[PDB]
Each structure stands twice: as C-alpha cells, then as structure tokens.
Amino acid sequence: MYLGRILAVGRNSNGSFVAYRVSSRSFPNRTTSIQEERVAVVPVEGHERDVFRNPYIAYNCIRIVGDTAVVSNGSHTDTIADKVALGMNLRDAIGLSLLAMDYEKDELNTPRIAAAINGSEAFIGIVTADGLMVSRVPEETPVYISTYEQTEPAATEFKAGSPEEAAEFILKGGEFAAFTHPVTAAAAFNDGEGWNLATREM
Amino acid sequence: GSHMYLGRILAVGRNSNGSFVAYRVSSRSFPNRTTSIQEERVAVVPVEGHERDVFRNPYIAYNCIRIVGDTAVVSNGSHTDTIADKVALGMNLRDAIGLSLLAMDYEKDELNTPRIAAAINGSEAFIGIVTADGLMVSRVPEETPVYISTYEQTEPAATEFKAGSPEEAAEFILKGGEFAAFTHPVTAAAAFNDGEGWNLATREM
Amino acid sequence: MYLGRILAVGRNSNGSFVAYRVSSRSFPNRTTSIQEERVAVVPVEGHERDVFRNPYIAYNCIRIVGDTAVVSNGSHTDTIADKVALGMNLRDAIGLSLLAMDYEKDELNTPRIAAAINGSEAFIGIVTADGLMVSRVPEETPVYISTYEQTEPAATEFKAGSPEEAAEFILKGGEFAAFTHPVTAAAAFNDGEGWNLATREM
Amino acid sequence: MYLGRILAVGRNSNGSFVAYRVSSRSFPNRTTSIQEERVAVVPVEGHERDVFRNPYIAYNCIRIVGDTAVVSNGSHTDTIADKVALGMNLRDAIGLSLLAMDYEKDELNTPRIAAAINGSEAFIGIVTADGLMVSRVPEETPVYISTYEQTEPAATEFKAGSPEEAAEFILKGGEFAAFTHPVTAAAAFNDGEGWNLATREM
C-alpha cells in the first residue's frame, strides 16, 4: 500500500498529461515549487539542511521541453529532458538515462522511475536492481508506476482537464487515495494549447 | 494465440541438473540453415550451396551462443558478440544486455523483428528484449527457467525445462515440451553446465 | 603506411560529402555495390564464402537517411544510421554505437571508425582498445580517419564536386595515393540537391 | 588562466592518486567534506541555499569503490562509481556516464570531466558540446584536465606521497599555482595499503 514516489502519464478526453506525487515516511518536510518550464521537489523552509543528509529528496520532477513533458522521481528528470531537447526519441532518452543512472543507492535500492509524452507518443520506464524496462504507453489508456510495490505500469482511469485536477487526483483521487503517506503533488497538462503546471498540497 | 509461429526462440535457467541456455531457429522463408559448433560458440549458418542467402538478408547468420568464462550468452543475432564481449571485457550481465539492446535496436525488416538475448553464470541470469515499442531486461527467476521469442511471446515466460546435457536441452527447445507447438522449426543449439563447465551441442529436425 | 580502412567527411566549395575506401592485405576479393540509399562492401563473385571466415569484411559502408549521410568501416553504419533515422543527434548516434559495439575482436583489435553529416553539422568518431572519441568536424576543413596509423582525425584539402570524384580521390587521389593496398572505394556527395552515390575500383 | 574545475590522475614513485580542485568565480562559499568512502563539495555553513540556485555546485567529487578511485566535477562521480562497483570496466563506466549525462546546461555549456584508476589501469574522460572523449592514462606519466581551457589530457610531473600532499599540490603547487580562483581541493592517494582521503583549503 505504501508505493513511495508515484508518477502517471497518458491521454484522456481532455488532453495529455503527466502527474507526480511524493510519498515519504522519513522526509515529509517537502513541497513542490513551480519554476520556469519545471516543477521541483524541495525542502520546506527551515529544512534546507535535509538535502545534505539524503541526496535523493530534492530534484525537478517535471520538465517541459517544447511539446514534450518529462516526469521522474529524481535528477534523471533533467538527464532525460536534456536528451529530448538535444534531439533523441523518447524511448532512448529514458533508456539511456535509466541504464546509466541506475537504481538509487539507499536502504531499499529505490528504483528510478520516469515517463515522457509529446504530441505523438509517450513512454514509461523504470530501472531497478533486478532489471530495466522502458515501454510505450498504450494510447487507449493512461498508466502509472511507483518506486515500491507497483514496479510495472498499471492502467488508470485518470480523469482531469487541467494540471490542478491531475495533481489533485494523483494525491487524493481515485485509487491513489489508498496509497499512504502522501506529501506533495505536481502535474503538467496539455489540452492542445501547450503545457501548464500546477501543484497540490495535502 | 492464433499464431503459433514465434520466430526465433531462446530459453535460459537452472534446473536440478545444472545451468543452461537453449536456442532454436524458426523460419518461414530461410529454412536452408543449420547450427555449427566452433570454439566456445555456436553459429547459425546457411547450409551448403546457400552461402548466398547471407547477402540477401543480413539477419540470418550470426553466433547464437557464446561462452565467455563462466558466462553463457545466447541471442537471435549479432548482438550475441556485442553482449559476450562486454561480459568478457568486464560488465555485469544486466548492463551488458541492456547497453547492447539499446544501441542495436529491433531488426529493420518487414516485421520490425525484436532483438532478444539472455546470459547466465554461476550467480545470476538476465533475459532481455528490444522491440519497436520498448526495451526490457530482467533477472531470470532462480526458481524457474524462462523463454522468449521474436514473435508472439515477446515477454519472458516460465518453462519446466528438463534436460541434463546440451544435447537434451537443444532437442527440447526444438521438438520437446511446449516448444513442440511452435511452428516452422529449422535448427537448434544449446549450452549446458553441470558444474564442470559449459558444453555445447546442436540438434537438427 | 597501410592505414587499413579509411573514411573522410566534410564540406568543400562544391558541397557536402563522405568517402570510404577499403584497404586490405588478406581480403582483396571485394568491391562496393550501390543499393537503395546505401553502398555495401561485398565479396566479388565466387568469394561469397569469405564472409563466413571473417565477420568484419562485408557491411554497408555508407547509409543515407534523409538529409544525413553516414559512413563507417563496419556494421555500425546501420546502428548509427538507424539512430539518426529514429531521431538522435549525430554526436550521440555515433557515440552510443561506438561505445556499445567496441573495437573489432580480431588480430589487430581493429578500431571501429565512423562519421555523419547533414546540412548543419558533421561528426567523426573512432573506438579503439585504448579509448573512445567522437568529435565535431571543423567547418573550415574536411578530415579523414583510418583503422590503423591515422587513428585520430586529420585535415585534408579534399576537392571533388561529385560522388564519382570523391570516391576516386580517397582511392587514388591526393595524399591517399601513398596509403597502400587500395581495394575498392565509394562516396556520397551533396551539392544541395540531395545525396548521390558512386563507386570506384582500382 | 581560469580552468574552472580541475582533476588529475595517475601514478608516481609513491603510489596512485586522483586529485580534484574547485575553481569558481561566482560560488566560492564552498568546501570539501570527507565522508565514508568519498569526498563531497558542499556549501559552507550559511550558504546551504546556493544548492537551489545552481544544481552543479554540490556533488561528490571523489568516490572510492574497492581498489578503484573515481574523480569528477559532477554527480557523474556516483554514476561512474556505481557502474564500477556493479561490475563495469573503467573505460565504459566513464563513457556510458558521460554520454548519458552530457555537458552541463549552464551559461558556458560546462563540460563534465572524470577519471578512474585502480591497480591496473587508469582512464580519463570529458564530455563537451563538441564531443566526447575517454582515453587510457599513460602509465609513464600523470595527467590532468579541466572544464575550461585545458579540455584535453595534459601531462603533469605530479609529486605527492599522501592524499594531503596531492590535494595541496593540485590546489597551490606546481603549474597549478598559475590557475586562478582556487576555492577548495581534495585527493585520494594509495601507496599500496589502500585509498586514503584528504582535503585542503586556501
């Protein structure tokens, strides 16, 4: 039931999207911050220091490069987004980044999860201590994946017609309500006019 | 389910008799082929008088099995040497397979044929595949062997694979167990290790 | 004085080009055959068998994909060209392919050499047993590289205004005359109308 | 005369080493901190906040894995070390990490530089906007490389018989005295008994 960090990607009747939600046991003093073309996961005021005791807690979790949205549970968000910007198809951007960066070297060998979507295709990947897998997101249905328990894409009837909605949904909505220790959430949505960002706190 | 033609098939794992990797060609338009054991490897080559086939299709001849030290590599194409070499030059199994599938990619033919592969040694085993919809490399479950093919069965599938010798294993993936049902069997090869070392073997239809 | 296989890439007053030329001691029974969008290095009639005794002799030495031309001394030619086709900048297409394929496992640990060019940039790389290097081709001057001896880019006042010209030059022209054991050659040229292929025999 | 971040690697009469030195114009409020099996570049007390305005200033510069020492100017220090730890040869570890992570997306397209050394070989590599290069370190002589100006290996008569010496030298000694804006320095030395770490401030 505690899935750790969760991300979602796909298309529904209202447009394309990516959603991210932090779930933590020992580092709840965090929030999401919208900056130019990106959403970062940072410590809340007075906890800046946390970053220096654990290197996997702060990072951009959503990057927007052109017509492409990138979402991941770590710094690989920039590694992948940079490859997209510099010209590289989605699948390889994810694969090359997950292969090189690998699972996180902590207590639980925490997988690095990620996904990216543009006007044509979307891909979702994950790298664990037991494997690496990058796959196409089925057009007929959005999907989500997490660091713990749900280590492989799972379909989700994800309704949302705005980044606000998406971000709230992965936080407290639908089936995500049953996953524990929700901290902060974020998302990007594109109804065809471009990517818009939004956050959502508990 | 309607299709029983899986194309090229490979299997890997450990049973009560030891470790192994098996491979079997299945073709519709290039049956003029067989497996030839050479030093530390098994190649898939045209049969005499068909040497020419290789120049009309670059995906029909390749080492399908490579042995490097305590490690056995198996695949449906030239990546067999790309992976084997990385293992030889020092690279863990998962990465070796993954870096090689990522670079080489699915085969650029009529059916965007996936590149499949697997490798095993004294400690772990990893199986992987690269298609036009993805790339996947995963640890082979210790409690059960598994197999994968270019068509239909594009993700690992468990198999009660019995055999206690390369001869046995190569025969099994060719005509035994559930592999019987997969059509157009051409040639087969395999590598087995009972703890003494890797031994190769071929099997014709 | 025997550089093995040699390739050249760059631009001159007449257009963009890539050139290739095989140089062999023990496998001269070879020629270059133009096919759709590519030039392959194959055994001469009655030698089809050679390929089974050495896996590094037959291969497409030039691939044209869109506005981009790819040239190498091996099968990586297709690895790199596919990544360009599927969308991947030139530097990475060459780098990823060279890193993964590595030097050829023969008597001389023969390096894998490659280059790619389009209307904007051009890159040349090589992978040996002592390293890996991929670099931008200097706009103000073509350059060449070979499997042996000249294992790093070298400038070349390369004149030619057609594939025919280019293929003949790298084979018997300029400084390439002094490099021994010339077997067959090939080249692609682009004067602004598209890529055109041409072979040249001794 | 400002080479940015500089690293050195090689063997001398006293043993094997890797040295690192930060040089900065706009972020001198930094020091090096030894922690388990590694040395990190971090903000000085009261500047924790800098980490959030620039994602390229805090990182482990040195990582020790077994008989191998890794040094770099970025997070790729862990990317490379982890691959080495998980079983990967030095050349590929550096090449796969530099290919995936790329030059740093800042004002100067700052290259990612790196090097690794164990009881047998040593390799140094760099990734820029113009290329990628990874090469074996010449056994008969140590070499150093930087982000700016000296973007290619360069020989250095690097004398030192202890991490303290090594660290001091890349900071204020020899030819490094002439490189400007020294902030902090660090190094790992191995005289055959194992890898020892040390830092040095201005």
Swiss-Prot record, chains A, C, D:
Gene Ontology molecular-function annotations: IMP cyclohydrolase activity
Pfam families: IMP_cyclohyd
GO biological process: 'de novo' IMP biosynthetic process
UniProt KW NAD keyword: no
Pathway(s) of this molecule: Purine metabolism; IMP biosynthesis via de novo pathway; IMP from 5-formamido-1-(5-phospho-D-ribosyl)imidazole-4-carboxamide: step 1/1
Gene3D superfamilies registered for this protein in UniProt: Inosine monophosphate cyclohydrolase-like
EC number annotated for this UniProt entry: 3.5.4.10
Catalyzed chemical reaction(s): IMP + H2O = 5-formamido-1-(5-phospho-D-ribosyl)imidazole-4-carboxamide
Keyword terms, alphabetized: Hydrolase, Purine biosynthesis
InterPro entries hit by this protein: IMP_cyclohydrolase, IMP_cyclohydrolase-like, IMP_cyclohydrolase-like_sf
Enzyme class: hydrolase
Chain's role: Catalyzes the cyclization of 5-formylamidoimidazole-4-carboxamide ribonucleotide to IMP.
Similarity remark: Belongs to the archaeal IMP cyclohydrolase family.
Protein's name in the database: IMP cyclohydrolase
Organism: Methanothermobacter thermautotrophicus (strain ATCC 29096 / DSM 1053 / JCM 10044 / NBRC 100330 / Delta H) (Methanobacterium thermoautotrophicum)
Gene: purO
